[PDB]
Amino acid sequence: GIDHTSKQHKRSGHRTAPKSDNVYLKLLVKLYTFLARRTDAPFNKVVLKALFLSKINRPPVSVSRIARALKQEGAANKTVVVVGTVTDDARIFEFPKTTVAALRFTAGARAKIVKAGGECITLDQLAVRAPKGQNTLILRGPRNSREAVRHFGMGPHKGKAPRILSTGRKFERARGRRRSKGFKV
Amino acid sequence: TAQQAPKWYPSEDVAAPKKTRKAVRPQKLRASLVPGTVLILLAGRFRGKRVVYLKHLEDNTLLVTGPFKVNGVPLRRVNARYVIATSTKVSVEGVNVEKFNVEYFAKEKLTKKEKKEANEIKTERVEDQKVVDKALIAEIKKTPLLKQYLSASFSLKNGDKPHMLKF
Amino acid sequence: PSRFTKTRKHRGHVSAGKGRIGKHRKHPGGRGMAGGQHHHRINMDKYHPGYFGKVGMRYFHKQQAHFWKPVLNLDKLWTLIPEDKRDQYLKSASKETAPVIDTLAAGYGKILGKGRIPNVPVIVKARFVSKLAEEKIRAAGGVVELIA
RNA sequence: AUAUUGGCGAGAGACCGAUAGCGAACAAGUACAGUGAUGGAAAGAUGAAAAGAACUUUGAAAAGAGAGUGAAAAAGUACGUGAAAUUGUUGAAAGGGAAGGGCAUUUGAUCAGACAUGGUGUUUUGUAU
RNA sequence: GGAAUACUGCCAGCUGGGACUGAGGACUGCGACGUAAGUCAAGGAUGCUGGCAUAAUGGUUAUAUGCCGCCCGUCUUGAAACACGGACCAAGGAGUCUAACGUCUAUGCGAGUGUUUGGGUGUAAAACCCAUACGCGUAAUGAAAGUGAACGUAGGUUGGGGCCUCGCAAGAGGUGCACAAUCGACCGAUCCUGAUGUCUUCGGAUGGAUUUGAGUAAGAGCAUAGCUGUUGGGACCCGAAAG
RNA sequence: GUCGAAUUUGGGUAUAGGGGCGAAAGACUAAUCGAACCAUCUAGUAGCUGGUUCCUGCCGAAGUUUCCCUCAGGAUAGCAG
RNA sequence: AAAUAUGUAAGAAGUCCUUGUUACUUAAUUGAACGUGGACAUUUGAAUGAAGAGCUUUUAGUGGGCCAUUUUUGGUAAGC
RNA sequence: GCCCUGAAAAUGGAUGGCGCUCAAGCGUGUUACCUAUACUCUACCGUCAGGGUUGAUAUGAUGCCCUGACGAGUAGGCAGGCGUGGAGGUCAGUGACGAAGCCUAGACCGUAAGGUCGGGUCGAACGGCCUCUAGUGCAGAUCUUGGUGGUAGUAGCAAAUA
RNA sequence: CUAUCUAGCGAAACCACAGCCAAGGGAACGGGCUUGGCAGAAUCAGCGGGGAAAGAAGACCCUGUUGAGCUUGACUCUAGU
RNA sequence: GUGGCCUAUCGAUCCUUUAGUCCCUCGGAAUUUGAGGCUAGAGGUGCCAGAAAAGUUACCACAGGGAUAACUGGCUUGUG
């Protein structure tokens, strides 16, 4: 027999083959897996592993984050990339001429960018403009902003937001939340 | 319809095999077998009969004769693993066996239309046997009892243990 | 649907995925939130702290319309202006033509200072505001006028 | 304006399809039980059309064998098809206080498939088969 | 004194016989012998010959033989059980539907989203179009009055995929999203300090605090569908004595 | 055993379900009585028993902690997917 | 006073040198803590192995246990 | 040290049995030998991981191919699939020259769920593929309804004079 | 008078499959398993050892956070007075 | 030096009550009583993570239990 140290036939635990049926996504995959296979660049592999992701892990990105990123040094003329969607943000008023590439663009974001002289682009054009990932800059958006995470790990002395519907007085502001009613936490 | 289709009909153009690496090297006969040797046949029409060995043919077979005047065995071709090489030795030198070869023994295979309901020889083969057996019996007469030793047959008796016998 | 339920895969397997030993019976721990001060005490103390007790002061005949005080941080404040005239009012960052903003007509009762509007003057109509937001406006050169 | 499992009248269905669907697809709130309140069933299909078997014969008669109608009586009012348990007859096989099963093989019975092909070729007829 | 032999051990020494298998399917490579040509036992078997070409091999089935084989389902530490149910056949028959929800996943849109209460319209319970509200979300915290989120490149440090530069590469350096840990800043609550001032009792600037929050710190949600799971409902099916 | 009486009995009539009647046994009350029968609430509840319908593949347990008018059961952590 | 079991360490987040902040601390730039800059690279600091490491969510069943080797308690002992 | 006495139980009786006595017993040792689903080698299936391959012309990139390791399993979890009633679509599908159903120690495919064919009976509708949907798959429940058995041509059909 | 045999008629309980024993082990008392012994069709009348024969989800005991009847200076109420 | 030299000597929601701030509300606007609230303790649940609680059934019943008794059988052999 064998003295098995590890588990047998255990999946990688990772994801391949985005299990959506979006044929266009599968085309992009058919392309970028080729590029990863043959270009020996890591950018392609990153993009590929990002295309496989779910929606909570394909979060949105704001032009404000983009402008933060471009306010870096030696990063203005760079080309931005987002494996996801791109939202607008009234919280700013200036925006540079920079080009961008991503799956989806909201009407507001696209209007803002082009109004700034830039261009909103698809990853298939990105590949032919920059196969190896020349002069690029990847961004991925925040995950721990979701409202579900607040409830993740809820115990005592954590600060972790019970799962609840109705908020107000007489909904969990009592025994176990203040000293005068028994105890706190 | 009844059954829809396959996505992909496999090809039919057969792939050729690979260049093998099994040549043919000639047969390494055992040591006990030398021309002029007396043999025993263990199977065939002529099983149990003692016979002579003359030639090693090209298709890993052996040329053989009774001779025919003795036991009714003609010129023939047999297999080395279906006989025994006795210790008995006789001379065969002065025999023009070089004529014979595999084509000499051509069956001229029978078709399928020719099925026998219920049920011939080549004079060339006959006279060739007649040519060789005379040269051989002239040597057999030299040593004693040998004509009889060939005319007789071989068999086992209660107590004959081949692994302890010596031929 | 049904044909993707695992009840279709439990056919033949006896217990339908509920156990031979524990035997899916009806209501073995109670019905509902029973046992909160008892055998479900740990669940309540751990995941729902504060479920037991009353706290404060009661409000008979509470109408949720005195408390209608929706907010509007200064971050936005221009969404209220259509983009048609927004860039005009921006690049014409000038006195004597300052744009007026009726938040109340938009459904916003209070004004708050999240941060950093530009240095253009504005005129704000509003019910309530806060100290910081007003400071930032009048620093940008605008003004606040209150209404009811 | 709203409600409406009752009543009357109409129309539709990703419903059920005679152990289902209302308890009831039929003389069903019927037969039947019970002192009584009450309870409460089972039961569909010959065939296009009865053309539902004239007539002969055995038998006391029922019925049977023939005959005949019929596309079909392997559709005969015990009637569409007509399963299984269970049973009978025939045929095969085995059989010492069980039988049955698995691996392997003998014996008996029984059974599928490949056997053309291209092809030198005209020894050829129907002259190109 | 001189040897042999055994015992143990080694050979990239030779040699004979026997058994099982022959996978793969143009070449490609490693190598030997060769002067070379080329050949080779070198990245998986080819050659020669015979018989039959049919129930002969084979399959199925019944029987015989050799060996093994306890009757299933179930509760159980433990069942072939001297533990329960089961004579046999057919048909029926048992985790569903919904309101509200969680996680995860696909889809549309995206700081917004949701047409379908309702109106218009119609090839008429369909499909198509739509206004205004409303819900959820974008702001929390406090019992409540009520207040209400940038000192700064929306911070600093550490580490970080990736990119840029130099470099043949090695590697070095710059930037460094997400994310993790951490010190700070900000909003509210609590406890303090209590300026200009003042209806002289109101107001609450400024600065703090081993305090505290389901918080901000360039928004991420809304809706539909799906498995799974939760609660209520007859609630996987049958089952009480009872009231 | 009793057999001219506290006798036996027919018919008519009264008493109805927490109620009747009882020479009293918890007996009888339409083969039903330590609370009838019928229908409904009602598919009453059940930590308890029994059963829980097709294949293959892959992974693979626990009977242990703490609390519970808890000890035939649940929540919790662990084990597992 | 053993044996067996047991905790920690065996480096880059380290060592060393220098000098910057502070409302803490000191008699005192004296220290403490965090820092800037600089040197120390494959023998980077013991061996072996690593089958990928780390992290999160969510949910099932279970929560009657039993046997043996050894240590051991009650009991005369027990398939207690 | 072996053997003996000690040493007595109940159906008949068990070194496993026969049986064994310089053993087929006891103690010990040297070799050979037997055989397990274990080990080694090879093939085949599957899973997992790592990889190669868009180039036109050909089919299928969730495809084809290469390499290596591994495979036990109750409760339980996940996945890929077979089948049933019905819907939307398509095959200008089959069909009285015989649909479906049923029988078939007759054949074929598939690991299997199951599918297809031939023969027979019968007489009117039915299916394959892509999707949807559910009152969806039974060996059981002292299950329900109906039917049929072994027991079994058995028990027994005997009070009231005939 | 039956039983018995015959003519006629003709059920039921029960039934996993069934039907030889010893010992062993085993859920500690097997018809099946293991080792042994044995074993020759089909049966009739009787018998009452066995099949832990059947009969009825043990009516004793225990548990149940299931009941009911009865009692009482239990708890909470109440008609009446 | 924040109770006893150390290790034990004690107690939730709700309700009541008291102390503090003299703070908030009584929702058409005010004043004063009164009530409600915030913060901190006390009144106690010893079945001590906390129900408000007497018996009997030889008239009994239901669900179940060999998880559990009364016979046998079995291991054991104290006692006999």
UniProtKB/Swiss-Prot annotation, chain A:
Transmembrane segments: none
Domain of life (superkingdom): Eukaryota
Gene3D superfamilies in the record: 3.100.10.10
Annotated family: Belongs to the eukaryotic ribosomal protein eL18 family.
GO BP terms in the entry: cytoplasmic translation
Main location: cytoplasm
Subcellular location: Cytoplasm
Residue location of crosslink Glycyl lysine isopeptide (Lys-Gly) (interchain with G-Cter in ubiquitin): K115
Entry protein name: Large ribosomal subunit protein eL18A
Keyword Transcription: no
Keywords: Cytoplasm, Isopeptide bond, Methylation, Ribonucleoprotein, Ribosomal protein, Ubl conjugation
Any one GO cellular component localisation term in the record: cytosol
PROSITE patterns in UniProt: RIBOSOMAL_L18E
Example GO molecular function: RNA binding
Pfam families reported for this sequence: Ribosomal_L18
N6,N6,N6-trimethyllysine: residues carrying this PTM: K49
Biological role: Component of the ribosome, a large ribonucleoprotein complex responsible for the synthesis of proteins in the cell. The small ribosomal subunit (SSU) binds messenger RNAs (mRNAs) and translates the encoded message by selecting cognate aminoacyl-transfer RNA (tRNA) molecules. The large subunit (LSU) contains the ribosomal catalytic site termed the peptidyl transferase center (PTC), which catalyzes the formation of peptide bonds, thereby polymerizing the amino acids delivered by tRNAs into a polypeptide chain.
Classification of source organism: Eukaryota, Fungi, Dikarya, Ascomycota, Saccharomycotina
Record's subunit section: Component of the large ribosomal subunit (LSU). Mature yeast ribosomes consist of a small (40S) and a large (60S) subunit. The 40S small subunit contains 1 molecule of ribosomal RNA (18S rRNA) and 33 different proteins (encoded by 57 genes). The large 60S subunit contains 3 rRNA molecules (25S, 5.8S and 5S rRNA) and 46 different proteins (encoded by 81 genes). eL18 interacts with NAP1.
Record's miscellaneous remark: There are 2 genes for eL18 in yeast.
Swiss-Prot record, chain B:
Source organism of the structure: Saccharomyces cerevisiae (strain ATCC 204508 / S288c) (Baker's yeast)
Identification of the protein by name: Large ribosomal subunit protein eL6B
Biological function: Component of the ribosome, a large ribonucleoprotein complex responsible for the synthesis of proteins in the cell. The small ribosomal subunit (SSU) binds messenger RNAs (mRNAs) and translates the encoded message by selecting cognate aminoacyl-transfer RNA (tRNA) molecules. The large subunit (LSU) contains the ribosomal catalytic site termed the peptidyl transferase center (PTC), which catalyzes the formation of peptide bonds, thereby polymerizing the amino acids delivered by tRNAs into a polypeptide chain.
More info: Present with 38400 molecules/cell in log phase SD medium. There are 2 genes for eL6 in yeast.
UniProt KW keywords: Cytoplasm, Isopeptide bond, Phosphoprotein, Ribonucleoprotein, Ribosomal protein, Ubl conjugation
Principal localisation: cytoplasm
Compartment(s): Cytoplasm
GO biological process: cytoplasmic translation; ribosomal large subunit assembly
Swiss-Prot record, chain C:
GO biological process: cytoplasmic translation
Region of interest (Disordered), residue spans: 1-38
Extent of motif Nuclear localization signal: 6-12, 23-29
GO CC terms in record: cytoplasm; cytosol; cytosolic large ribosomal subunit; nucleus
GO molecular function terms noted in the UniProt entry: RNA binding; structural constituent of ribosome
Family matches, as SUPFAM superfamilies: Ribosomal proteins L15p and L18e
Superkingdom of the source species: Eukaryota
Gene3D superfamilies membership: 3.100.10.10
One Pfam family in the UniProt entry: Ribosomal_L27A
Basic residues bias spans: 1-13, 20-29
InterPro entries: Ribosomal_uL15, Ribosomal_uL15/eL18, Ribosomal_uL15/eL18_sf, Ribosomal_uL15_CS
Entry's localization field: Cytoplasm
Keyword list, A-Z: Cytoplasm, Isopeptide bond, Ribonucleoprotein, Ribosomal protein, Ubl conjugation
Crosslink feature (Glycyl lysine isopeptide (Lys-Gly) (interchain with G-Cter in ubiquitin)) location: K95
Subunit structure: Component of the large ribosomal subunit (LSU). Mature yeast ribosomes consist of a small (40S) and a large (60S) subunit. The 40S small subunit contains 1 molecule of ribosomal RNA (18S rRNA) and 33 different proteins (encoded by 57 genes). The large 60S subunit contains 3 rRNA molecules (25S, 5.8S and 5S rRNA) and 46 different proteins (encoded by 81 genes).
PANTHER family per record: 60S RIBOSOMAL PROTEIN L27A, LARGE RIBOSOMAL SUBUNIT PROTEIN UL15
Family, as annotated: Belongs to the universal ribosomal protein uL15 family.
Protein function: Component of the ribosome, a large ribonucleoprotein complex responsible for the synthesis of proteins in the cell. The small ribosomal subunit (SSU) binds messenger RNAs (mRNAs) and translates the encoded message by selecting cognate aminoacyl-transfer RNA (tRNA) molecules. The large subunit (LSU) contains the ribosomal catalytic site termed the peptidyl transferase center (PTC), which catalyzes the formation of peptide bonds, thereby polymerizing the amino acids delivered by tRNAs into a polypeptide chain.
Name this polypeptide is given: Large ribosomal subunit protein uL15
Protein species of origin: Saccharomyces cerevisiae (strain ATCC 204508 / S288c)
